Amino acid sequence: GSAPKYIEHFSKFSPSPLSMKQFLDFNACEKTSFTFLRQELPVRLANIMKEINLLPDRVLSTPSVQLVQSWYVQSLLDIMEFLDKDPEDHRTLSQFTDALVTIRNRHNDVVPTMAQGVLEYKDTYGDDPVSNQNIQYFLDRFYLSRISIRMLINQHTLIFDPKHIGSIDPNCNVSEVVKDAYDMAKLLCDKYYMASPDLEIQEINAANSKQPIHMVYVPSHLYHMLFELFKNAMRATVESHESSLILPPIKVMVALGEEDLSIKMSDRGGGVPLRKIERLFSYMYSTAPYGLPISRLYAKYFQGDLQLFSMEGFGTDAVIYLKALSTDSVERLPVY
Ligand SMILES: CC(C)c1ccc(COc2ccc(CC(=O)NCCN)cc2Cl)cc1
Ligand SMILES: CCNC(=O)CN(C(=O)c1ccc(O)cc1O)c1ccc(OC)cc1
Ligand SMILES: [Mg+2]
16 A cells, blocks of 8 residues: 555645634635645644654554544545546546545544543553653643544635635624633533533623624634533532532633734632642543643634633633634644
8 A cells, every 4th residue: 555655755745724714715616726725734634643653662552542643544544536637627526525525524532532541651662751741742742633524624625515615704792602611511511410500691892892792703602612611610610619608600701903803701510729720621631541732722723722720719710712814813733
């Protein structure tokens, strides 16, 4: 097979970061999505794949890793078939959309799969702080790559099967997403614990004090983040107040500045000591048999961040930082 040489060739290129604007203005035809994607997906696949091969042999050769490696190889090849094929012919384009579907689905399990490699590495070689920085280093990169691949694939399959533009909403009402996520967390909350804290939203539109706040974002990404955060702050809030009678609400503030859109979630769940805050964002230190770390990646993906500050004995604030303007929302992609 050619697999290694394909990887060699396409890993000389660099992934091409797109902006939400550049995403938005796409439909400027499938032909163009097609010809773009058949080059770029191979690039992004190759780049992470060569980085996977920089992993030391004791990691490199466990079942978990070798398993995802096989998936990425089959994908690269699945996409290969379409290099000499041409557009104008509408079955080329249709067979492609189908190929993009199969790939996305094949990869639905990378998270639990990799997570398994961390566990067998913990039990096999130790949980030292160095291993931890490499695992952290490698996975932050690996997942992020992975997210952007999905982003491309979803932009294609959804548009070339209007208010929305695929996975993007150009009029994303943030509190709308905040509540939905809240409502879903509460449901799970009311089931397991049969109590649940309330929600207070407040907006602060700096430039336009009385205007409801809208942005251009990918709302499922935003849902995902807010969801984990609500889960966590509910869980804490309940268990911290099980001998008490009052259950403190979860206050969220959504704030819009000249370049930031920022979302704080404040809970009175009894806090976490400074010492333990790193552990929460660590893939290794929070592995037992998404979480915060993956939700963070989503934040980073379009030049955002997601941060935590607690006060032990009281509560935790968690902040989602997003870029306010489509121009600033460029993809953050790892490169080899
Ligand atoms: C399966 C995935 C999650 C996984 C699980 C476990 C690991 C562990 O990765 C390590 C551990 C130790 C070292 C030191 C070393 O030998 N350095 C040599 C070069 N200085 C490097 C790496 Cl990349 C990575 C990825
Ligand atoms: C006594 C109850 N105490 C907590 O459960 C502490 N707890 C926090 O305080 C906390 C942490 C993260 C967060 O975004 C919000 C929080 O309130 C916490 C919540 C979720 C979590 O998942 C692993 C770990 C810790
Ligand atoms: Mg932090």
